[model samples]
Target: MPVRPDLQQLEKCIDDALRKNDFKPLLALLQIDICEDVKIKCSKQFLRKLDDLICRELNKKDIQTVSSILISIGRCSKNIFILGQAGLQTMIKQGLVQKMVSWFENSKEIILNQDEAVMNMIEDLFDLLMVIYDISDEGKNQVLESFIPQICALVIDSRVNFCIQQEALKKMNLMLDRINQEMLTLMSNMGERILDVGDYELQVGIVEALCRMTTEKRRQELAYEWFSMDFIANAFKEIKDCEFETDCRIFLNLVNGILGDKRRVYTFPCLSAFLGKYELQIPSDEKLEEFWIDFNLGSHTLSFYIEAVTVPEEKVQMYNIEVRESKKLLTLTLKNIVKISKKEGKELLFYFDESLEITNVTKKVFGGLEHH
Candidate 1:
């Protein structure tokens, strides 16, 4: 849509376009022609417009099939991961977390869920959590309050329960973390206002969402009809279940963690303070596979606490998380090992798996358990 000297000049225009930061014009151009019935006749509407330009400029065929977000200069995979992440990070830093989240919610196809695509979004959200803190304790409760409606809806929905309806209940219990503090007196210590509300359907809905195994929102949505917490684990749950390198269930949380109340925190202290306020406490001396749990409400739900630690002069172990509950039993454990720093917060470049083993050379201790 910009000025082009000639048909031949289009290539230069595209080349120069890709190098620029904004995509407003390019995106607009695609939007303008999306409804061209004449072009759609050939089932190559995108290609034809792309072909309208001189062939020497860019590959007409490639440009035709390029996904919306990748439709820059029509080049595929062009340091896009870095560029998208950098752009998104800058936006969030500018307090545009809500906007980015809308982009994903409104247009998930933009990134296609590719590893880098998803990671790019997750990386920026993860990077920015240290600075932004808006999620509120009350907001999460509202969603939990809606959980029953959501879960019961999912249980009965053919699409959600699928063939697993009967088997789902059996397998559902298998997927949950063992009980702990969030469920009992530990949660009460925070002086959390339970409001003594009741909604049977919502409770089941919320439970169903948490029990889902796959991390994607769409899949979880099939089961989380009442609300998205079932679609997404709480921010703390996300951190506890944080996938070291593989990157799972990130996009959904990245969006909610930013937009929801009582914003998310990345560091151990922030996480600790946030948990402590809710009657959640990380045992100061807990090390390796041992959890300190406080039961609250005498219900099936509970809170989990874990930390990213370095330096364990006393313990040398592989990977484990242990939870001990006051009123009930919990079996969930977040597995982390190589996370122990190699040498004072340095990357362990020599690990056999070549994964991120940030070195502080300390003990990696995690306390919390899943009900499963």
Candidate 2:
């Protein structure tokens, strides 16, 4: 079969060079990107050969040059299967494996890539981590500790395009599981924030992993929180633009999930909500009830207001006023909310957000979109 541009010539060139056991030509030819922007792509055997040729070539180059080659080679093609036992063992013995680990840990771009090799690199790195740890805890910690933050950063800043329901997150999650509490605490204590990108990812991963592994109330909490950030947001946005009572309720619950302050208020500052309110009354008692019913502010708080009330009923609304700080005192008016039903005219609740005009659902933006 025809290979890629730079790689198309690789097989023939390698065959020619192999007869001599000389690596210079193979090095020059291998740089020909087998897969264009993807660095390298070819049959599995070819990839193995390329790794071999590159590793052999390294003996001819100095360590400084070899480090650069390792970085380049890492990005070339992700399948380390080309890194069969003898090959990886050699690289590990020569310290090139450590260099590859360094490159991957430092470069977030590699972590977030879609390349198959890049994806496979996860297991390769995990395997390297195991080997390095077995060699010595100091070496292991030096390698793994540097990664904790980067992994956390990736997890916390997971993009909409990211595959959260995949092994990448799963590995990080499971890694946290096997790690001892001292390591976890050490990881957490390494920074001032206590919960930096690493902690967030590890925390989310642990929660998700726990939820996946065993049943517990905390697992539900993690699932609920994950749903809060990811599931509900995506679900609500995708819900039918034309919805019924059930849809509206489900949508509101999603909104509710997103609006509250995360219980880890001090630790997790992702969402914090505040509120305001006003009352409108009709002049005459005759029309007072109808007019008051007409302009029920809570209705808008629950639905569509320029500045939406985050909570269907917020404690801060009372906290704002000297009148009273009682949840009971807030007589949240709901208009057109009691929709017609076969059995009963049920009172569907919205919110008495900032506006007394309860139906309008508008919210001020609260959280920043990305993390470093």
Candidate 3:
């Protein structure tokens, strides 16, 4: 092994350069793989210095220096975390998030056309993005507005390599609901190859983005409009070999959302086939019970108790919800509470329409379906 450069000496050089407003040594230090070392004694003052250096470097069109500093900031979680805690205001005031995204976008074309070494620059940018979002709600909104759509555009671009596209999809998955589906038109034009792709990581990301895109009513129809019989066939084929529980849910939700009232026709077989295939991976009643415990809304707490497990010998089961908010009491009996979606068992049993008609009502029966 070659002799290691003293990090203390390196820091001294960087400090001296900063004092003299000569960032050459600082930039040189950044150009090497010293992100970890640079971040060891990193403080708010150090970040302010780095931010100032970045600004000055940008004005001078010193791309290498500016880029190197960013790589340093990106690579060091210690530095990123400290920025979030102590100097978030300073970072925001200096437009650090904006600059990082700008650099990220500017670097994307280069990274895509180039190979591993160039692509390696972004190794820590994802963490940087997530950490910024971790720090402030405003930063989170800003990231959603700026970064996510850029990532989507990269993913949607056919010219870009699949690896980069998948990378973009993964980052976009981290921050969902930022893209307006109609404006983007990705949900319209991209279903052909999307559902057929074999990469589970990419598929999971695509499903998440797709779910948010189609969550609202008007766009829900787009799921059907975009996906045809061929789409459904491909989805089924992919579902047959599905290894990830997430991938299974993706197909089920996709097929269900697109099929509309046709869901009554397709949901049973699609889900039944899913249950048949992934029986071992499926969650048990006790596991389902454990999940229900952790899932909750914040205010006006909701509680569910399985008062009775009726019809144990039969497929259909029943449960009672004894509602007691303050004084008045009501008991609602739910039917056919069988295990349907492995991730969320029997998702339909509690499905409620938030329509204006049903909003104020205490209870309204939407009629029952008799399936043979």
Candidate 4:
């Protein structure tokens, strides 16, 4: 093998670059994969120098440099190997989170202009907030106290670009479990404002965030409130008009949550048209061991199969399926099945287990039916 690169030389170059206030070399270093030992040795110095640069840039109101530094810091903060627990603590001690939040608040006017550079900066700032929230409970508390309302304002403000609003919604989605009742009220008010003005994407983002509320009672109450307002009703029309299959699928799940059996009354022509696109085929008789009848919804797939086994005295047939999303796979086995054959098509319903209680209307948005 070739001779190893000199770690001392690498560290010395990083130090010299920081001394010269030249971040390009440091940023480049961050981009390339360095050894864990190298990252461990340099992260303290890196965070400190970056913290100083961020404060100085904020003081100078240098948006460009501040944005650049935030990008570098964001990259470092997100990588555990680069900025471990201690390094993150170093950043917190430097008060970088507060500094960044204050800078964002001060620069709202510029952010509203929707300039490409400024938008990039706003995205970087939001991303950094998310990383901080993930690592430290103290940081999470700080962000919850100070930054969340600003994000809700961004979501509700029609003057803000949909792109930025969507970004804000995404961040809120990530923190839904931690947000309190006050924030939920704020988000409810946001939903009222954006119901008419927001595009399908923004509306979908908002609906998703609402759907993700940690508490079942809160989700049902909000769903009831939204359902009463014709908010979800209008979404059906918009999705139908736009004919966006992805949005249709999301609303399909939302409607499943909000209306359940009552969804039949609200079904527009587009609902059938969208559902028709993904027809789950009846499995062939020539089965070897196992096969899947898959329904490929936009964000996830539902794969259904049947199994037969002897339970001492008799053969028991069970329906089984897997709900597959990008990061999660949920398997459900059902003993009861309701299969209906109509002129239009076939409908297969699998009743879920009683243990999986469905009190919230928004629960069971995906596969399977709920029976009390």
Task: List model 1 lDDT by residue over 1-372, tens digit each.
Answer: 964233223333343444553334454444442221221111112223333332322232222223333342222111112233432233333334343233323322332222333333333322222122213333223323332232233334333211122233322233233213233332221112111111112222233334343354443332233223432334323322244211222332243235333322111112121211132334554222233221112121222233333222112223222223321111222232333213222111111111212121112122121122
lDDT against the true structure, per candidate, is 0.27, 0.35, 0.46, 0.50
Highest TM-score scorer: 4
Query: Compared with the true structure, what per-residue lDDT tens digits does model 3 show for residues 1-372?
Result: 954444334435446555786655554555456454343444455655665555565555554555565555544434433434544545665576787776675665565554443434454556677777766787787877787667766655656655566666767766764436544475555554344342333444565566554444443455556566755645634532224343445464465447553332111110111122233122334322221110111111122223211111123222222223322222223343344333323322322222212111221111221221
Q: Please identify which of the two predictions, 3 or 4, would achieve the higher TM-score against the true structure.
A: 4
Best by lDDT: 4
Superior by lDDT: candidate 1 or candidate 3:
3
TM-score order, best first, reads 4, 3, 2, 1
Each candidate structure's count of clashing pairs: 53, 24, 0, 0
lDDT of 4: 0.50
Q: Which 10 consecutive residues of model 4 have the lowest summed lDDT?
A: 267-276
Q: Rank candidates by lDDT, best first.
A: 4, 3, 2, 1
**RMSD (CA, angstroms), candidate 1:** 19.5
Q: Against the hidden true structure, what lDDT does model 2 obtain? A: 0.35
> In candidate 2, which residue ranges exceed 4 Å CA deviation?
1-97, 105-107, 110-118, 134-139, 159-161, 164-168, 180-372
